[PDB]
Amino acid sequence: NVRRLVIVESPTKARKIAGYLGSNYVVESSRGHIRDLPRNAADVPAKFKSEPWARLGVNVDQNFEPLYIVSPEKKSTVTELKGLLKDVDELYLATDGDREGEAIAWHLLETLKPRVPVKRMVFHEITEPAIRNAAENPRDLDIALVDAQETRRILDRLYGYEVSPVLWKKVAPKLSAGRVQSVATRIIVQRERERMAFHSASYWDVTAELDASVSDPSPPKFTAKLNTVDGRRVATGRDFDSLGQLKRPDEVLVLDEASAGALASGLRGAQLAVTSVEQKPYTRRPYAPFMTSTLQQEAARKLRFSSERTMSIAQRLYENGYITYMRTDSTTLSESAINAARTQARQLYGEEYVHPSPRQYTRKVKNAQEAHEAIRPAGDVFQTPGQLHSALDTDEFRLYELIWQRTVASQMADARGTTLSLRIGGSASSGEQVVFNASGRTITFPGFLKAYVSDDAESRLPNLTQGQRVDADLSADGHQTSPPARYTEASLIKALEELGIGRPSTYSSIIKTIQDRGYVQKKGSALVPSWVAFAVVGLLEQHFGRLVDYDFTAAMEDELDEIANGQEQRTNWLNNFYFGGEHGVEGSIARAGGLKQLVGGNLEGIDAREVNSIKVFDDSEGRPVYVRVGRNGPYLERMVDDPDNPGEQKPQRANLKEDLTPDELTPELAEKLFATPQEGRSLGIDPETGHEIVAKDGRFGPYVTEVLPETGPKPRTGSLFRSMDLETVTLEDALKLLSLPRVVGVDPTTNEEITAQNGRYGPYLKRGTDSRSLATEDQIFTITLDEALKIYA
DNA sequence: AGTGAGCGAGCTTCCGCTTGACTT
């Protein structure tokens, strides 16, 4: 009888472990990590902070020795474990079977400093057998796995706190760069460039409702569509030559409003024959059970939930004991879960809808770690979703309903059906051998679909015969080729998973991180990159390309495996990565000279002007169009010929609205934004000359000016009256101010001219150098020469 | 005696594990 102390990661797991292991057992939780590198200069411990150069938390010159400090929030949890350790016999470290949990075991060892024998308890599924077997057969700490966790923690540290300060001095302050986020942002930027270089092509489709009811009128209504016409096929959106114009034009034929509109009008009905009929039975295999990435994607598709929202719900379900661990990267179900899954389906849906052999899904993810089982309902027997409606919330129920269906459907039979593919041929009345086509699908055996819901896109039909006579409602609609869709929260995560980037505990947080730093804007349900993202990604692609390559994360994992099995030393690769060496793999940083040289030796050699200047296209005249970033808001800029200095080009600029997306900045919109007024409000165009009149605010007062096309004439100005306002003045009021110096006539006494204007002190007329005041703004236009002479003498 | 020019401090940031609870 030995009293053993057990330390797990999740507190709700600690309750279940303490239930399986009884009296002589004390199970407590650590709530994740207890130590980590100091995040800022404040977290650095007083002694080791003030003296050396520990901004990185890894004094690299001293053999990459990390600086671990205990979290102040967990500082009360660490002291709680030290007190319980002095009253037990042995210490079991029961962290997850991942390389992060192994480090947590080591960190608990180096912090508590146990003067007591220690053993390593590991387990995948959390059940009574799995934990009793694990507690009876412990293990030893894997130092090679712990050092592989420190290698990546320092790697993400050197990547982070050494490259992001380059962005500060070359893009904008407080920005960030990383191994995980910079690739996701590069993905969003690269996808946006695909839309910014995508040219659309317009085509016309012709829908038709086939009237085959004169054959067999045994409900029936069938719709069809045209496929080809003689040696020319109906061009669709599939001829974009990968987001361009078109390719292979001899096989297809483009359709416009008049060309396709003639085929629908050339034959309302026609004597057509069935050239081919072919039906075939199809199948559809079920989906693997839920891991974290697949749950976040299907919650967004079927429930319109967000990653941050989905995980908050699943946390409630897990902590209350309704599902298993939601942060998982494995689709494996435990033997108890499979027995619960097949019994639940056999009892409810029946024995016919189950599967003979238990279905195992072994499609592993790139550099997965397999520490937990798939997200599935808790308990040795699954509680039906209807048996939990009284306790669950609205969001809790819908999510548990989606999780329960996924687990059960993963063990049910395949779906068997049959599709219908019929082709219609013949000739046209105008003189063309047109050929139509219509495809349909019909389900037969549901199987797993009885608990799930386009594997069942249906288009019912009646009957037909090969070579039977059919008769042809007609409509010709036009379409344009659509650009490749942007990334959502789901489509981005599945993109990172295909690259081995991110972990179940970071998916929902990557979205929040790239948003809270201006790199991406969430336009409803799509991730739109900003111009800062184009500048940050544009910089990293040209000076740290190996760091932002999609294979870089896979190249790191292959290097951490040689440290996990014990073939390569921990410090060796970090030394080569940070300082260099001819032992590079392909085009690695070691073959480049090390990250330190790639940062300190490039600060002098980065052109922030070209980095913040993002050329989008060339205008109709061939001049390049840039997008300056950081210069007090993003705006357009281009170098045009200068009127005063010949040769030396002058830049014209146009402020860009913050709500404009990068793919919407077309050359047609660019020149229209250049013609917009600089800082004033535009009033209109004067028909007498053709100049645009605007109302600005200058050094003296609110005035009105014309613009000139780039004798040598000056721009005519005119200061508005006291009765006018800067935003209320019209083009009419302006056009009067532009000719305000009005010569009411010459005075015969002194030969001088009399002109009426308006100044600071209201309206006034001047008799050469003598000027008298007026009492009405409108009277400078109604003043006669006679009335002006009566007061001037 | 109140304001607050003009010069210009010291700071920013990386991945992953995982629940925390006070008083005014």
Numbering used by the authors: 13 to 230, 233 to 467, 478 to 496, 498 to 735, 756 to 838
Question: What does the paper behind this entry write?
Answer:
The defining characteristics of type IA subfamily of topoisomerases include the formation of a 5′-phosphotyrosine bond in DNA cleavage, the requirement of divalent cations, and the selective binding of single-stranded DNA (ssDNA) during catalysis. Every bacterium has at least one type IA topoisomerase related to Escherichia coli topoisomerase I for overcoming topological barriers that require ssDNA strand passage. These bacterial topoisomerase I protein sequences exhibit a high degree of sequence conservation in the N-terminal domains D1–D4, where the active site for the cutting and rejoining of a single DNA strand is located. In contrast, topoisomerase I in Mycobacterium species and related species of Actinobacteria have Topo_C_Rpt type repeated units in their C-terminal region that are different from the zinc-ribbon domain. We hypothesize that while the N-terminal domains of bacterial topoisomerase I containing the DNA cleavage active site interact with the G-strand ssDNA to create a break necessary for DNA strand passage, the C-terminal domains also need to interact with the T-strand ssDNA with high affinity.
We succeeded in obtaining a new crystal structure of a catalytically active 839-residue form of M. smegmatis topoisomerase I (MsmTOP1-839t) in complex with a 25-base ssDNA, MTS2-25. The construct MsmTOP1-839t includes the N-terminal domains (D1–D4) and three of four predicted C-terminal domains. In addition to the N-terminal toroidal assembly (D1–D4 domains) and the first C-terminal domain (D5) that have been characterized in MtbTOP1-704t structures, the second and the third C-terminal domain (D6 and D7) have also been resolved. Within the structure, the 5′-end regions of the two MTS2-25 oligonucleotides in opposite polarity form a 12-base-pair dsDNA containing six non-Watson–Crick base pairings and mismatches. In the dimer-like MsmTOP1-839t/MTS2-25 assembly, the C-terminal D6 and D7 domains of MsmTOP1-839t from one MsmTOP1-839t/MTS2-25 complex binds to the very 3′-end of MTS2-25 (5′-TTGACTT-3′) from another MsmTOP1-839t/MTS2-25 complex, and vice versa. In this pre-transition state, the active site tyrosine is in position to attack the scissile phosphate that is four nucleotides downstream of a cytosine recognized in the –4 position by a set of conserved residues. In the MsmTOP1-839t monomer A structure, the C-terminal D6 and D7 bind a ssDNA segment in a 3′ to 5′ direction. Each domain interacts with two consecutive nucleotides, primarily through two parallel π-π stackings. We do not observe here any interactions of the arginine residue on the β-turn (R724 of D6 and R805 of D7) to form salt bridges to phosphate groups of ssDNA or contribute a hydrogen bond.
